[PDB]
Amino acid sequence: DPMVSKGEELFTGVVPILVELDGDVNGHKFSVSGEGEGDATYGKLTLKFICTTGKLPVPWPTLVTTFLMCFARYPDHMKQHDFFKSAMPEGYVQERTIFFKDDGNYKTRAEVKFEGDTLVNRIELKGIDFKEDGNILGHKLEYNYNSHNVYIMADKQKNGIKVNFKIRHNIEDGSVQLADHYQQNTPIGDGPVLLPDNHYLSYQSALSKDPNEKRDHMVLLEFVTAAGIT
């Protein structure tokens, strides 16, 4: 399929990645830079993020979703449902509202696209209505991350997709902070895109620290595999 071919030819090997985020949560301003690489053959991403403005005013785990679904491994039987690669190289827009149960919300807008051989994720994040002493602004969230399925459906009328899912972040008292994600993606280009049957992406995410890094940062390892269309 010459369409399926165009995304294979873009993602076949290891692709360098750059991430840039500008944040404002309750007027707490911050900037994060990320670098690393994806290998969609293995559904694999390796990234390191640095808060370049000092202390990150929110927990790192709250940002993991915001900080690359074009790097999903879609099994061979499922290549015709891979919207994300299909939008490339022109890229797509990923928008979210993320409602933290009993606390504030994030509204995110991202542009995911190639800048030459580099896959780039440019993000703006605005957070509003947080409790200065809640789980988020009071940094009560554990530095860890659970596995989660993410459910994709077409949004035919917008030539794109909608994605809905919940993340439960562990609190340090042993309870969980719910983070209910609503998402929409739309291609940046005017060309055809692959619009998927309902399926899901399975995520595993491991958070770590770079022993020689003094800035406030996060090392993120993610594996992402499409499923749910046998």
CSV table of C-alpha atoms in Angstrom, one decimal:
chain,number,residue,atom,x,y,z
A,1,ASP,CA,0.0,0.0,0.0
A,2,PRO,CA,2.0,3.2,-1.1
A,3,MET,CA,0.3,5.1,1.9
A,4,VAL,CA,1.5,2.5,4.5
A,5,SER,CA,4.9,2.6,2.7
A,6,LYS,CA,5.3,6.4,3.3
A,7,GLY,CA,5.1,6.0,7.2
A,8,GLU,CA,7.3,2.9,7.2
A,9,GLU,CA,10.0,4.8,5.3
A,10,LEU,CA,9.8,7.6,8.0
A,11,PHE,CA,9.9,5.5,11.2
A,12,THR,CA,11.9,2.3,10.2
A,13,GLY,CA,15.1,2.8,12.3
A,14,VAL,CA,16.0,4.9,15.3
A,15,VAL,CA,14.6,8.5,15.0
A,16,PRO,CA,16.0,11.4,17.2
A,17,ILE,CA,13.4,13.3,19.2
A,18,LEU,CA,13.2,16.8,20.6
A,19,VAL,CA,10.5,18.0,23.1
A,20,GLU,CA,9.8,21.6,24.1
A,21,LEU,CA,7.2,22.6,26.7
A,22,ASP,CA,6.1,26.0,28.0
A,23,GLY,CA,4.0,25.7,31.1
A,24,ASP,CA,1.9,27.9,33.4
A,25,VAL,CA,0.0,26.2,36.2
A,26,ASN,CA,-1.9,28.6,38.6
A,27,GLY,CA,0.6,31.3,37.3
A,28,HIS,CA,3.6,29.0,38.2
A,29,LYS,CA,5.6,29.4,35.0
A,30,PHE,CA,8.1,26.8,33.7
A,31,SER,CA,9.9,25.4,30.7
A,32,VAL,CA,11.0,21.9,29.9
A,33,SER,CA,13.3,20.6,27.2
A,34,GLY,CA,13.5,17.0,26.1
A,35,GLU,CA,15.8,14.9,24.0
A,36,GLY,CA,16.0,11.2,23.1
A,37,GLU,CA,15.0,8.7,20.4
A,38,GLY,CA,12.3,6.4,19.3
A,39,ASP,CA,12.3,3.1,17.5
A,40,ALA,CA,8.7,2.4,16.5
A,41,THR,CA,9.7,-1.1,15.2
A,42,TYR,CA,9.9,-2.0,19.0
A,43,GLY,CA,7.3,0.5,20.1
A,44,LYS,CA,10.2,2.0,22.1
A,45,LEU,CA,11.0,5.6,23.4
A,46,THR,CA,13.9,6.8,25.5
A,47,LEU,CA,13.7,10.5,26.6
A,48,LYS,CA,15.3,12.8,29.1
A,49,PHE,CA,13.5,16.0,30.3
A,50,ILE,CA,15.1,19.0,32.0
A,51,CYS,CA,13.3,21.8,33.7
A,52,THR,CA,15.4,24.6,32.3
A,53,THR,CA,13.7,27.3,34.5
A,54,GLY,CA,14.7,25.7,37.9
A,55,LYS,CA,12.3,23.7,40.1
A,56,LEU,CA,9.4,22.0,38.2
A,57,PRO,CA,6.3,23.3,40.1
A,58,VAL,CA,4.3,20.2,39.6
A,59,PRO,CA,5.2,16.4,39.9
A,60,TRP,CA,7.0,15.0,36.9
A,61,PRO,CA,4.5,12.0,36.6
A,62,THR,CA,1.7,14.5,36.0
A,63,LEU,CA,3.5,15.5,32.7
A,64,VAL,CA,4.4,12.0,31.2
A,65,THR,CA,1.2,11.8,29.1
A,66,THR,CA,1.8,15.3,27.6
A,67,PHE,CA,5.5,14.6,26.9
A,68,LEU,CA,4.6,10.7,20.9
A,69,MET,CA,2.0,8.1,19.6
A,70,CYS,CA,3.6,8.0,16.2
A,71,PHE,CA,6.2,5.8,17.9
A,72,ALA,CA,3.6,3.0,18.7
A,73,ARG,CA,4.4,-0.5,17.4
A,74,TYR,CA,1.4,-1.3,15.2
A,75,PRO,CA,1.4,-5.1,14.5
A,76,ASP,CA,1.4,-5.9,10.7
A,77,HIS,CA,-2.3,-6.9,10.8
A,78,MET,CA,-3.0,-3.4,12.1
A,79,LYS,CA,-0.9,-1.0,9.8
A,80,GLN,CA,-4.1,0.4,8.1
A,81,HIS,CA,-5.2,1.9,11.5
A,82,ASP,CA,-2.1,3.9,12.3
A,83,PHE,CA,-3.3,7.5,12.0
A,84,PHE,CA,-0.2,8.9,13.6
A,85,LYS,CA,2.4,7.8,11.1
A,86,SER,CA,0.0,8.5,8.3
A,87,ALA,CA,-0.1,12.3,9.1
A,88,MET,CA,3.7,12.5,8.8
A,89,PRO,CA,5.9,14.2,7.8
A,90,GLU,CA,3.5,17.3,8.0
A,91,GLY,CA,2.5,16.1,11.5
A,92,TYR,CA,-0.6,16.4,13.7
A,93,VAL,CA,-2.0,18.5,16.5
A,94,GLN,CA,-2.6,16.7,19.8
A,95,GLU,CA,-5.0,18.5,22.2
A,96,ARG,CA,-6.0,17.5,25.7
A,97,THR,CA,-7.9,18.5,28.8
A,98,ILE,CA,-6.7,16.5,31.8
A,99,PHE,CA,-9.0,16.7,34.8
A,100,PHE,CA,-7.3,15.9,38.1
A,101,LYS,CA,-10.0,14.5,40.4
A,102,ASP,CA,-10.7,17.0,43.3
A,103,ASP,CA,-8.2,19.4,42.0
A,104,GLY,CA,-7.2,21.5,38.9
A,105,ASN,CA,-7.1,20.8,35.2
A,106,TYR,CA,-4.4,20.9,32.4
A,107,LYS,CA,-5.3,22.1,28.9
A,108,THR,CA,-2.5,21.1,26.4
A,109,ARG,CA,-1.9,21.9,22.8
A,110,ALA,CA,0.9,20.1,20.9
A,111,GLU,CA,2.3,20.0,17.4
A,112,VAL,CA,4.0,16.8,16.5
A,113,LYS,CA,6.0,16.8,13.2
A,114,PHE,CA,9.4,16.3,11.5
A,115,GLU,CA,12.0,19.1,11.5
A,116,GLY,CA,14.3,17.5,8.9
A,117,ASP,CA,15.3,14.1,10.4
A,118,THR,CA,14.2,15.1,13.9
A,119,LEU,CA,10.7,14.2,15.3
A,120,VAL,CA,9.6,17.3,17.2
A,121,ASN,CA,6.8,17.6,19.9
A,122,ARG,CA,6.1,21.4,20.7
A,123,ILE,CA,3.8,21.8,23.6
A,124,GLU,CA,2.0,24.6,25.5
A,125,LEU,CA,0.3,23.6,28.8
A,126,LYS,CA,-2.0,25.8,30.9
A,127,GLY,CA,-3.1,24.6,34.3
A,128,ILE,CA,-5.9,26.3,36.3
A,129,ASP,CA,-7.8,25.8,39.6
A,130,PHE,CA,-5.3,23.8,41.5
A,131,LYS,CA,-5.1,23.6,45.3
A,132,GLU,CA,-1.7,25.2,46.3
A,133,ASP,CA,-1.4,22.4,48.9
A,134,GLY,CA,-3.2,19.6,46.9
A,135,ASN,CA,-1.5,16.5,45.5
A,136,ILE,CA,-0.2,18.4,42.4
A,137,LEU,CA,1.0,21.8,43.7
A,138,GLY,CA,1.9,20.2,47.1
A,139,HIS,CA,4.0,17.5,45.3
A,140,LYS,CA,2.4,14.5,47.1
A,141,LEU,CA,2.7,12.1,44.1
A,142,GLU,CA,5.0,9.2,44.0
A,143,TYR,CA,7.8,9.1,41.3
A,144,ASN,CA,6.5,6.0,39.5
A,145,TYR,CA,4.0,5.1,36.9
A,146,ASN,CA,1.4,2.3,36.1
A,147,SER,CA,0.5,0.6,32.8
A,148,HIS,CA,-2.6,1.8,31.1
A,149,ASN,CA,-4.6,1.1,27.9
A,150,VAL,CA,-5.5,4.1,25.8
A,151,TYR,CA,-8.6,3.8,23.5
A,152,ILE,CA,-8.6,5.3,20.1
A,153,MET,CA,-11.6,6.1,18.0
A,154,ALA,CA,-12.1,7.9,14.7
A,155,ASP,CA,-13.5,11.4,14.7
A,156,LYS,CA,-14.6,11.3,11.0
A,157,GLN,CA,-16.2,14.7,10.9
A,158,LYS,CA,-12.9,16.2,11.9
A,159,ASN,CA,-10.7,14.0,9.7
A,160,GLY,CA,-8.9,12.9,13.0
A,161,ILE,CA,-9.2,10.8,16.1
A,162,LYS,CA,-10.5,11.1,19.7
A,163,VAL,CA,-8.8,9.3,22.6
A,164,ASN,CA,-10.2,9.0,26.2
A,165,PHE,CA,-8.5,7.4,29.2
A,166,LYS,CA,-7.7,7.5,33.0
A,167,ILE,CA,-4.3,7.6,34.6
A,168,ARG,CA,-4.1,6.8,38.4
A,169,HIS,CA,-1.0,8.4,39.9
A,170,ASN,CA,0.1,6.9,43.3
A,171,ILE,CA,-0.1,9.3,46.2
A,172,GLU,CA,2.6,9.1,49.0
A,173,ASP,CA,-0.1,8.1,51.6
A,174,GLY,CA,-0.8,5.0,49.5
A,175,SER,CA,-4.0,6.4,47.8
A,176,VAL,CA,-4.4,7.4,44.1
A,177,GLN,CA,-4.9,10.7,42.3
A,178,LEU,CA,-7.2,10.2,39.2
A,179,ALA,CA,-6.2,12.1,36.0
A,180,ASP,CA,-9.0,11.8,33.5
A,181,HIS,CA,-7.7,12.5,29.9
A,182,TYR,CA,-9.8,13.8,27.0
A,183,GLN,CA,-7.8,14.0,23.8
A,184,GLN,CA,-8.3,15.0,20.1
A,185,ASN,CA,-5.7,14.7,17.2
A,186,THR,CA,-6.1,16.3,13.8
A,187,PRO,CA,-3.6,16.3,10.8
A,188,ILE,CA,-1.7,19.5,10.1
A,189,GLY,CA,-1.6,18.7,6.3
A,190,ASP,CA,-4.4,18.7,3.7
A,191,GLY,CA,-3.5,15.2,2.5
A,192,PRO,CA,-5.3,11.8,3.2
A,193,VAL,CA,-4.8,10.1,6.5
A,194,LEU,CA,-5.5,6.6,7.8
A,195,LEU,CA,-8.7,6.8,10.0
A,196,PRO,CA,-8.7,3.9,12.4
A,197,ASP,CA,-11.1,1.2,13.5
A,198,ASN,CA,-11.6,1.4,17.4
A,199,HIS,CA,-8.4,-0.1,19.0
A,200,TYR,CA,-6.1,0.7,21.8
A,201,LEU,CA,-2.5,1.4,22.6
A,202,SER,CA,-0.9,-0.4,25.6
A,203,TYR,CA,1.6,1.7,27.5
A,204,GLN,CA,4.3,0.8,30.0
A,205,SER,CA,6.3,3.7,31.4
A,206,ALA,CA,9.4,3.6,33.7
A,207,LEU,CA,10.6,6.9,35.4
A,208,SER,CA,14.2,7.2,36.5
A,209,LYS,CA,16.9,9.8,37.4
A,210,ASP,CA,20.2,10.5,35.7
A,211,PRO,CA,22.8,10.1,38.5
A,212,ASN,CA,25.1,12.8,37.1
A,213,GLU,CA,22.3,15.3,36.5
A,214,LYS,CA,21.9,18.2,39.0
A,215,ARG,CA,19.0,20.0,37.3
A,216,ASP,CA,15.4,19.0,38.0
A,217,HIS,CA,14.7,16.3,35.4
A,218,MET,CA,13.0,13.1,34.4
A,219,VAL,CA,14.3,10.0,32.4
A,220,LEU,CA,11.4,8.3,30.7
A,221,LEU,CA,11.3,4.8,29.1
A,222,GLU,CA,8.1,4.0,27.4
A,223,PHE,CA,7.0,0.9,25.3
A,224,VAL,CA,3.8,1.3,23.3
A,225,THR,CA,2.0,-1.4,21.3
A,226,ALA,CA,-1.2,-1.2,19.4
A,227,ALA,CA,-3.8,-4.0,19.9
A,228,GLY,CA,-7.5,-4.8,20.1
A,229,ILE,CA,-8.2,-5.6,16.4
A,230,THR,CA,-7.4,-9.3,15.9
